[PDB]
Amino acid sequence: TDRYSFSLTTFSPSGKLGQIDYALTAVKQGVTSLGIKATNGVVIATEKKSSSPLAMSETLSKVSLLTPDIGAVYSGMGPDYRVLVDKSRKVAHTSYKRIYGEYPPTKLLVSEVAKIMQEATQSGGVRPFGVSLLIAGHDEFNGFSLYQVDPSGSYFPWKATAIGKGSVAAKTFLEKRWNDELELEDAIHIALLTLKESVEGEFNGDTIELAIIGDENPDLLGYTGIPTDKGPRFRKLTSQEINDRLEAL
Amino acid sequence: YDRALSIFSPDGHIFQVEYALEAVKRGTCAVGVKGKNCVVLGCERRSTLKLQDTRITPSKVSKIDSHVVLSFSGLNADSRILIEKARVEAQSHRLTLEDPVTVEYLTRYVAGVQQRYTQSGGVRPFGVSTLIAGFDPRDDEPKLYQTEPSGIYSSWSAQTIGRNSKTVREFLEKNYDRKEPPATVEECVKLTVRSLLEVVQTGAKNIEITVVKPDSDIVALSSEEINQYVTQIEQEK
Amino acid sequence: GSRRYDSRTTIFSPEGRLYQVEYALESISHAGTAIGIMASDGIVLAAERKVTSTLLEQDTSTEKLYKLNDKIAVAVAGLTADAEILINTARIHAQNYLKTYNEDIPVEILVRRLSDIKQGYTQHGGLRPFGVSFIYAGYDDRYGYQLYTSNPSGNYTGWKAISVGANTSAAQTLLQMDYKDDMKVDDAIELALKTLSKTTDSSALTYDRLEFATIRKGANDGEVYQKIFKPQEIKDILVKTGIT
Amino acid sequence: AGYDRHITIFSPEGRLYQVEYAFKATNQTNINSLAVRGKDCTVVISQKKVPDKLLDPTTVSYIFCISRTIGMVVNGPIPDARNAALRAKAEAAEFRYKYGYDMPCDVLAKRMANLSQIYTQRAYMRPLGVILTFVSVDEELGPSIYKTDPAGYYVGYKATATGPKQQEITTNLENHFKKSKIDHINEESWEKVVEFAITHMIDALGTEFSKNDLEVGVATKDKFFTLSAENIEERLVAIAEQ
Amino acid sequence: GYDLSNSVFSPDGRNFQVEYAVKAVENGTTSIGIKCNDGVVFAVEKLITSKLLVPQKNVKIQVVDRHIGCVYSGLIPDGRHLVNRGREEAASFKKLYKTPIPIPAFADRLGQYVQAHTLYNSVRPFGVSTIFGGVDKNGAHLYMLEPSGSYWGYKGAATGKGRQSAKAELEKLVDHHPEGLSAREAVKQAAKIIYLAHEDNKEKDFELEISWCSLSETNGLHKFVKGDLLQEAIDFAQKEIN
Amino acid sequence: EFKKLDDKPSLVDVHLLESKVYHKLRNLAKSKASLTAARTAANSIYCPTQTVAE
Amino acid sequence: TTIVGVKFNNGVVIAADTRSTQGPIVADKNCAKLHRISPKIWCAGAGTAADTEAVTQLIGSNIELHSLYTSREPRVVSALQMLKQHLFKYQGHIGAYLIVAGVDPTGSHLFSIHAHGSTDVGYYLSLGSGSLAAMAVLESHWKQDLTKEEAIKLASDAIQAGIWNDLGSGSNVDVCVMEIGKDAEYLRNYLTPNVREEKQKSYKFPRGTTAVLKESIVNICDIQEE
């Protein structure tokens, strides 16, 4: 049989829920990622890591695509991120590209994924996924938006934030480095410079993964001859583009 | 889930029925006294807290049919699940058998409801004890029943449940008579107010009284009314 | 096996009492304060955020305040994840009521329904509670303005002035001395602000740390304008009352 | 509670000790593998040990044919090896049926991976204590090795080894591709990749091998074969005559 | 605690439950499997508990299909469940593919069933060792299945109390006959080492049951050796040990 | 003023130049003082290879 | 309603027309029957309108979910298969007639699926209601080894002659030419049949001609402000 349907998350005698207190520590035992929100775009940047140096790193993704306007990036556990990215996409199609026949706004996508975490907090046979996600995306009506979904199932919008183990120091660095108008060109130099204070590792495009929800690219459209729609506003930055910016810091 | 929340005890009990009775002890106190042609349920409300909306909030006496009232002591939150079952059974009786329910049939139903959550797996008993009172239709005998979280039902001549019920029960041996109720409706109300003033105390604003007369007349007396009845008792005492 | 490791958290204590309910009540005074004050002309809902950072975006945030329908909004205090769920349960219930009777829900009915939902989780199934406390401001014609608090056990009582969350005892004492039965909405706004200035869990009390919302009879033709204010309209009425 | 690692629950350190215990149980057969990407092939070599004369030597095996293109090499206990061999077969039928081409190795890495997560998320499923090496030759991604592990973590490889003495092999492979300065050996035929592979293994493990103590599996283009002890015998003489 | 169940793990690679299942099989009676050129020959030592018994009226060798002999030791009732399950699985395969099941196929199936009983809280891993084989059209095969869900090919296998005496004597038989021996000649060999395996069990008296599946005697069916052929085996062994 | 804005490893070099100044003013009492402060700003592991060579 | 697909060894052209009908009344004068399963896989639909459009939605979603998990570009054959199973469990009560045209890491393609679960191969397929008329044209002027410049004339003229030999056909010819190694090219309104004849009288009326029995004003645009 089975009889694991009793909650394995319970209130603690001192209050607060023990299992979500445990999961958050775990996020600061991980890799480091940060996101800066610019006026005209959004950037996320993170470190790529593997067991041995003889492992690849192009066959691994820690910036993943939910929609053509919305990417996610994590800090926490690799295995636990992989499954929730898939579930994030599955619920984005079934409840918004079938019923409105288009992609969801960033706020609306955030909220869906926050329910999935929530039933990992409630009920038996689950323990919380041990990740913190950033969900930066763009929708047309509220423009650029940056979120953070936590182990607990709440979300928060931020103007600039970081997650991972080098987090406490990184948000202090970005406090003085945030400005009221920051351009996307300028921001790219910022995120690299912050994550350089946070990463010792050999600093190339091949170890720093850069993704922007900048502006629309009609060349990643995959078709032409439709002027009505426009291409992906997401654009994953491969090693060559980051290498020029390495030299410009 | 199908695992027990009821684990048999070597004592000749189940722990959770003993725990459920304490929970009832800690609850607000209800009195029931039946006249010759009325029923009277008096209940304590803690109105001690200030800036309480009392208009919009339901009394601790709920009508479940047009002639059957249910009052309760113990877990207030839990009680509402019982009140929703019982209102549902009342219609079902009209549907399939016709006529309104009898107080006895409804009391038995309640008895089997609280009983169920003892004997089933996956559930803990309700720690809620009811006073079910009312009239049967075509009839004018007041019938006053008490059901308790053991899922045991009783008829009573007069009863009290709740906090410090014992103090009122000793008073009721001595001022209500098994042989003779007080015959006017008014005197019966004042006998129950006079009883309430033992433990409740602290002014007459924490007293609430619902009076039911046959032929389907449930009216609840306001504070003003109580104020006059209490002052009389006060002066005479 | 499984029965061995079963928590059994939905059994009574020797006191007849439910440890996990109390543990939920303990943890909501670790979340921010949300206050309701009922004026005769409207209802002020005044919430103090449980987060603040200068790098926070707290401007699109409506992280305490939710519309359940255009006539009944809530103030939320507790674990936000559990709360989000009930919020879309409630929307689903409002719209259901509206489908079947083609008439908006009274405040009495929707508060009883959420409460029964909570009741189920503490009653059986071996689950832990949903640790949330809602302050319902709503308007209906049948009983007017009605103000309500519900707790994780699933029990409700109406109030003329209430406080939930952090420093419940404290806010209650204050409210009792500076309440009057009938006020204008402004006087209420003022009072809402004033209580949070004496209870604030940081010395400073600011607009960007206030979520603040009303429901006003300043809509003509006996209608109610639900207004969730922009933080730049909060900034002016906070300089008005002379806090800042 | 004293229960805190009977189920897959975080620790005060924020960790899954339960899952770590799987990785201390991936080394009980104490077999070692090394797998290298040629230029137009993949080659994977593993040790064979029989504990008695009274077994049949053929059936003793660790290299399990999943697709006709995807081989799978198993480090850790043979009960969980088999359960891993079966699940994989199930998905390979499943992919062809619904998408109308044969399963890509890349896609088998994520399915079997996500399945692993699901075993560490139920509080009543014990994870497989097998590190799987998936070897393939794809046309869309070229020759690839994907390594999954009991956590469900995975990454690609240029070469990789597994086994308790696998540190030693890591030295040989690191030194080797340091000198070549490329991720793959420029050799256009599978023969000489079997010849190279055995050489690093002789260096690393410190023992020379025989025909009946080897087990070799080779992924070429569009077919997956295992070589028998006789074909392996030929390969060994030709290392000596280099 | 971490030494009590099957879903637990412990940082020694041990999973103490399953190892405890071998200890059950170790209380069993000797059972051997002699792999011959033409088939398989099982024999089981059957303890005669009391003179009150009705003799030769309990079979500890039960047939599965019509061509796969099955004999098990450990917990007798527990084993009867495992055989019933492999008779379901044989019958499902016979329908769906309209041929009698191969023995490497029968292996997959049973193998899976016992492996299953180490991954849930609410089950116990069975404590029996099976020995099963026969003739299929790819030839005769033999398998021994551990309670851990481990198995291998075997030219001779055993389990039981007197697995100590039996094993050493099976080495002797592959060094007597390293080019194999006949299934007829092997009836007399199964008698001989079952008798020697009762010098670890000489507190009682016993009855020898012998069954065979060989191509060349029984037309590839799982039959019992009975009547006068069976007593020639009894006499042969009886005189060597005297 | 940039010591409240201490976060940059580019303050390593400023201490190193102050050390050089006292070196050619030919007092090594104070030379050491600024050298200690150079090792303290370069204790941060995010400093280039070239500044450490300095 | 006609569909041609013309495979050549450089790419593929798939063209269809914009007249949709609901019986003898013309339901829509321009509607795009060329659907994008994927960016690199365009199909067109003939047959029941409400069943083509909706099932390009179902598979459009399912192919994007699929490709994201595979981290490789779609196969054409993947589209064809998803459709096949889906149609077949309703047992032909969804009357989809698709020509599934697509480039992929295997090359240029053209497939057909019919309203029962039947699937056919070919370097020229013709499908739909006005099929018969387009098919006749094709076999006379085709040959294998076309360019995109040959192919585009032949397909579009078969669609133009389909107008003039069928009554469901009509209005503008849309063409999509999907080459290998390029972004798909939606050359919409490649061929105009005819421009609507100029009418000889203005019919815009005097103001105040109609009568109003009552009226009222409601603005739903706002809820009553402060």
Curated annotation (Swiss-Prot), chain A:
Function, please? The proteasome degrades poly-ubiquitinated proteins in the cytoplasm and in the nucleus. It is essential for the regulated turnover of proteins and for the removal of misfolded proteins. The proteasome is a multicatalytic proteinase complex that is characterized by its ability to cleave peptides with Arg, Phe, Tyr, Leu, and Glu adjacent to the leaving group at neutral or slightly basic pH. It has an ATP-dependent proteolytic activity.
Stored InterPro entries:
Ntn_hydrolases_N (IPR029055), Proteasome_alpha (IPR050115), Proteasome_alpha-type (IPR023332), Proteasome_asu_N (IPR000426), Proteasome_sua/b (IPR001353)
Its subcellular locations are: Cytoplasm; Nucleus
Q: Name one GO cellular component term.
A: proteasome core complex, alpha-subunit complex
Which BP terms from GO are recorded? proteasomal ubiquitin-independent protein catabolic process; proteasome-mediated ubiquitin-dependent protein catabolic process
Q: SMART domains of this UniProt entry?
A: Proteasome_A_N (SM00948)
Indicate the quaternary assembly. The 26S proteasome consists of a 20S proteasome core and two 19S regulatory subunits. The 20S proteasome core is composed of 28 subunits that are arranged in four stacked rings, resulting in a barrel-shaped structure. The two end rings are each formed by seven alpha subunits, and the two central rings are each formed by seven beta subunits. The catalytic chamber with the active sites is on the inside of the barrel.
Q: What Pfam families does the annotation carry?
A: Proteasome, Proteasome_A_N
Swiss-Prot record, chain B:
Name of encoding gene:
PRE6
Transmembrane segments in this chain: where?
A: none
Q: Name one GO cellular component term.
A: proteasome storage granule
What's the miscellaneous note?
A: Present with 16800 molecules/cell in log phase SD medium.
Q: What is its main location?
A: cytoplasm
Q: Which organism is it from?
A: Saccharomyces cerevisiae (strain ATCC 204508 / S288c) (Baker's yeast)
Q: Which residues carry this modification: Phosphothreonine?
A: 57
- Heme as a keyword of this entry, yes or no, is no
What GO biological process terms does the UniProt entry carry, in alphabetical order?
Answer: proteasomal ubiquitin-independent protein catabolic process; proteasome-mediated ubiquitin-dependent protein catabolic process
> What protein name is recorded for this chain?
Proteasome subunit alpha type-4
**Gene3D superfamilies, sorted:** Glutamine Phosphoribosylpyrophosphate, subunit 1, domain 1
Which family is it part of?
A: Belongs to the peptidase T1A family.
Could you tell me what this protein does? Answer: The proteasome degrades poly-ubiquitinated proteins in the cytoplasm and in the nucleus. It is essential for the regulated turnover of proteins and for the removal of misfolded proteins. The proteasome is a multicatalytic proteinase complex that is characterized by its ability to cleave peptides with Arg, Phe, Tyr, Leu, and Glu adjacent to the leaving group at neutral or slightly basic pH. It has an ATP-dependent proteolytic activity.
User: What keywords would UniProt list here?
Assistant: Cytoplasm, Nucleus, Phosphoprotein, Proteasome
From Swiss-Prot, chain E:
Gene Ontology annotations of biological process type:
proteasomal ubiquitin-independent protein catabolic process; proteasome-mediated ubiquitin-dependent protein catabolic process
Q: Where in the cell is it found?
A: Cytoplasm; Nucleus
Write the record's keywords in alphabetical order, separated by commas.
Answer: Acetylation, Cytoplasm, Nucleus, Proteasome
Q: Which domain of life is it from?
A: Eukaryota
Principal location listed in the UniProt entry:
cytoplasm
A Gene Ontology molecular function term for this protein is: mRNA binding
Listed under GO cellular component are: nucleus; proteasome complex; proteasome core complex, alpha-subunit complex; proteasome storage granule
Describe its PTM? The alpha and beta forms are probably products of the same gene with different post-translational modifications.
Q: How does it assemble?
A: The 26S proteasome consists of a 20S proteasome core and two 19S regulatory subunits. The 20S proteasome core is composed of 28 subunits that are arranged in four stacked rings, resulting in a barrel-shaped structure. The two end rings are each formed by seven alpha subunits, and the two central rings are each formed by seven beta subunits. The catalytic chamber with the active sites is on the inside of the barrel.
Other observations noted: Present with 12000 molecules/cell in log phase SD medium.
User: What's this protein's family per the entry?
Assistant: Belongs to the peptidase T1A family.
Write the protein's name.
Answer: Probable proteasome subunit alpha type-7
Q: Which species is listed as the source?
A: Saccharomyces cerevisiae (strain ATCC 204508 / S288c)
Give from-to of the shown chain within the full protein: 7 to 248 of 288
Swiss-Prot record, chain G:
**What are the boundaries of the signal sequence?**
none
Instruction: Drop me one GO molecular function for this one.
Output: threonine-type endopeptidase activity
Q: Where is the active site?
A: 1 (nucleophile)
Keyword line: Cytoplasm, Hydrolase, Nucleus, Protease, Proteasome, Threonine protease, Zymogen
One Pfam family of this chain: Proteasome
The disulfide bridges present are none
Q: What is its EC number?
A: 3.4.25.1
Enumerate the InterPro entries for this protein: Ntn_hydrolases_N, Pept_T1A_subB, Proteasome_bsu_C, Proteasome_bsu_CS, Proteasome_sua/b, Proteasome_suB-type
**What is the predominant subcellular site recorded for this chain?**
cytoplasm
What are the GO BP annotations of this UniProt entry? proteasomal ubiquitin-independent protein catabolic process; proteasome-mediated ubiquitin-dependent protein catabolic process
Q: Where in the cell is it found?
A: Cytoplasm; Nucleus
Q: Which family does it belong to?
A: Belongs to the peptidase T1B family.
Q: What else is known?
A: The side chain of Thr-1 acts as a nucleophile, and the N-terminal amino group acts as a proton acceptor. Present with 11400 molecules/cell in log phase SD medium.
Stated role: The proteasome degrades poly-ubiquitinated proteins in the cytoplasm and in the nucleus. It is essential for the regulated turnover of proteins and for the removal of misfolded proteins. The proteasome is a multicatalytic proteinase complex that is characterized by its ability to cleave peptides with Arg, Phe, Tyr, Leu, and Glu adjacent to the leaving group at neutral or slightly basic pH. It has an ATP-dependent proteolytic activity.
Tell me what this protein is called: Proteasome subunit beta type-2
- Say which species the protein is native to: Saccharomyces cerevisiae (strain ATCC 204508 / S288c)
State the gene name recorded for this protein: PUP1
